[PDB]
């Protein structure tokens, strides 16, 4: 264990709270990001109809990237 000044990975090694819910994966299994409510997308980040945060460059790149395929739907980017 470790002090409340540190957040425990689900591995055994604990990183500080400033590194938790900061948009950066610094847990081996990512248990420091996929628990907090910071679901915001960046200024340049495209948003799927499914809510996933995908880079804007990935949109209509020719290959499906997002779970629902909205990134490559003909409606979302005309072809």
Partner 1 sequence: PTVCRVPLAHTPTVTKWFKGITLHLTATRPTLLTTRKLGLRADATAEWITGT
- 12 to 21, 31, 32: CA distances (angstroms): 18, 11, 12
- Residue 5 interacting entry, from partner 1, Ca ion, none, C-beta within 5 to 8 Å by type: partner 1
Choose among Ca ion, partner 1, none what residue 29 binds, the Cβ cut-off being 5 to 8 Å by kind: none
Burial class (CB in 10 A: 0-12, 13-18, 19+), 27: buried
Nearer Cβ to partner 1 (2/17): 17
Q: Which is nearer to partner 1, 17 or 77 (CB)?
A: 17
Smallest distance from partner 1 to CB 5, Å: 6
């Amino acid at each position: 264990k470790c002090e409340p000044s540190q957040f425990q990975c689900t591995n055994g090694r604990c990183i500080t709270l400033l590194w938790k819910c900061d948009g950066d994966e610094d847990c081996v299994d990512g248990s420091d990001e996929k628990n907090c409510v910071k679901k915001t997308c960046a200024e340049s980040d495209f948003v799927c109809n499914n809510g996933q945060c995908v880079p804007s460059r990935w949109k209509c790149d020719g290959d499906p990237d997002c779970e629902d395929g909205s990134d490559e739907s003909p409606e979302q980017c005309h072809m």
